[PDB]
Design a protein around this nucleic acid. Structure first.
Lengths: 215, 220
RNA sequence: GGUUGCUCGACUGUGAGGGGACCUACCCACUGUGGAAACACCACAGGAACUUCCAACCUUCGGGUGGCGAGGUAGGGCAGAAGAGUGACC
């Protein structure tokens, strides 16, 4: 039978200088064969605590492991902003080895309103029959933001796709790119294209827009 | 230190196919260390895969691969291998290579990881991006639109990497074609518009596609 | 005929708490540390505890030293001893 590493919480928002506690609970005893790893987006994992309380070579004293029976807990005394990452427990007490589902940690800063811009589809693209309109919400926080496309004052539904940056660890902020896509024919059927942002840092939903053709 | 791990042999593979990942070691010999493969499906977690024990060659495998994968090692080549057979979709992941540390120093911790190779099990064929420019209009923003490619990954640098600051390149999202589209943007002060050349460099190795799209202002 | 010595000796026994610690060599194991070491290989240390013993060594005969893997194979040791001899005595 496999040893389960059951980590919680799935995710953690907290303030710089907070204490954050992540707990992992091994379905069987794993002695002290528990290791904690920090993984930032796109990088490899990096070792933090080996053998469940032993601070790895070169890891900052604000990290620490803690065993209590079948319960292991990684503990940051005071967040720095760089400490944005996903954290995983591992057990190597037996094979197969096993990891926690991880815990995603988020910085917390004051609010910043999004800088907003809108991009009308490039002239090469419209030749190729496609028409993509891009709207950018730049360097903002918190990430919870509503975008609404309106074409000739009609709300659009199910033809935009957005994506977000991770927290710029220096910035502790986010950037979003919402993308309305139409056929060239459907693009040539309307004049005005607009992008309506509702964000907590805005007192009023900001709209950047353009007309088809204006130079 | 010189301790380094270099995965390779990843890519796009048809389901049911095979692949042999490779992991070259630098600055240490793998003869004295336990060596593990660890994989991560996109935006999912770390999954232990296989491992081979120093001095014995004893191999251990995660149960989701047992009898389709095969960890192994050539001492002389200071290289560790992983033969994957009868692959399926859910085998898609970045496949990382890690050195289990020396016991007296780092317990059974994995102390050195590679950068991981990307394994993309799908029958859909490759297709490189069309790259369109995002024209701008005391600062405003401009970028590139990296549209309808497959598979991941693509890479954007502006001005051959000379322009690093202010840039946001967004994660590819999945077009309902199945292709990936993404866009990259940098903000600049509006003065530089006339006098500053702004090229984004797009590379999509799976397709052997390299594009450089000069981003200039509104023509009129 | 006994009785008792003395020598050789088939063969057997080394027996576990109201009771078993003999030696050696290989083999096979169990536990723990350490070897660049989760398994494997290697080196080293150890086989609960309280007892029990002295096959072993030393002894001023008071005692002392050294000593346990209940595994297997083999050779010994220590004990018995079918049996032969061979004395002494009656």
């Amino acid at each position: 039978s496999d040893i389960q590493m059951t980590q919680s919480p799935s995710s953690l928002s907290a303030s710089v200088g907070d204490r954050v506690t992540i707990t992992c609970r091994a379905s069987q005893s794993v002695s002290s064969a528990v290791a904690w790893y920090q993984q930032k987006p796109g990088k490899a994992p990096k070792l933090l605590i080996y053998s469940a309380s032993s601070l790895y070579s070169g890891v900052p004293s604000r990290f620490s492991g803690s065993r209590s029976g079948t319960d292991f807990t990684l503990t940051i005394s005071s967040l720095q902003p760089e400490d944005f990452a996903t954290y995983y427990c591992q057990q190597s007490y037996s094979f197969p080895s096993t990891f926690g589902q991880g815990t995603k940690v988020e910085i917390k800063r004051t609010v910043a309103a999004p800088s907003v811009f809108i991009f009308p589809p490039s002239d090469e693209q419209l030749k190729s029959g496609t028409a993509s309109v891009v709207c950018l919400l730049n360097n903002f926080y918190p990430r919870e933001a509503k975008v609404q496309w309106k074409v000739d004052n009609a709300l659009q539904s199910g033809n935009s796709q957005e994506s977000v940056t991770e927290q710029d660890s220096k910035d502790s902020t986010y950037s979003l790119s919402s993308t309305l896509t139409l056929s060239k024919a459907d693009y040539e059927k309307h004049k005005v294209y607009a992008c309506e942002v509702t964000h907590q840092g805005l007192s009023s939903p900001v709209t950047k827009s353009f007309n088809r053709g204006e130079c | 230190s010189e301790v380094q791990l270099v995965e390779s042999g990843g890519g796009l593979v048809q389901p049911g196919g095979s692949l042999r990942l490779s992991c070259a070691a630098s600055g240490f010999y793998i003869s004295y260390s336990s060596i593990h493969w660890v994989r991560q499906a996109p935006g999912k977690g770390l999954e232990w895969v296989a491992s081979i024990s120093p001095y014995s060659g004893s191999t251990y495998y995660a149960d989701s691969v047992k009898g389709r994968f095969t960890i192994s090692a050539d001492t002389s080549k200071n290289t560790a291998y992983l033969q994957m057979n009868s692959l399926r979709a859910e085998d898609t992941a970045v496949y990382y290579c890690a050195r289990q540390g020396y016991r007296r120093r780092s317990g059974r911790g994995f102390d050195y990881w590679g950068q991981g190779t990307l394994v993309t099990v799908s029958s859909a064929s490759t297709k490189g991006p069309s790259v369109f420019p995002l024209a701008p209009s005391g600062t405003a923003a401009l970028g590139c639109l990296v549209k309808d490619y497959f598979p991941e990954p693509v890479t954007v640098s502006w001005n051959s990497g000379a322009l690093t600051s202010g840039v946001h390149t967004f994660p590819a999202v999945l077009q309902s074609s199945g292709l990936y589209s993404l866009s990259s943007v940098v903000t600049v002060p509006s003065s530089s518009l006339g006098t500053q050349t702004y090229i984004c460099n797009v590379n999509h190795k799976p397709s052997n596609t390299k594009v450089d799209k000069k981003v200039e202002p509104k023509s009129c």
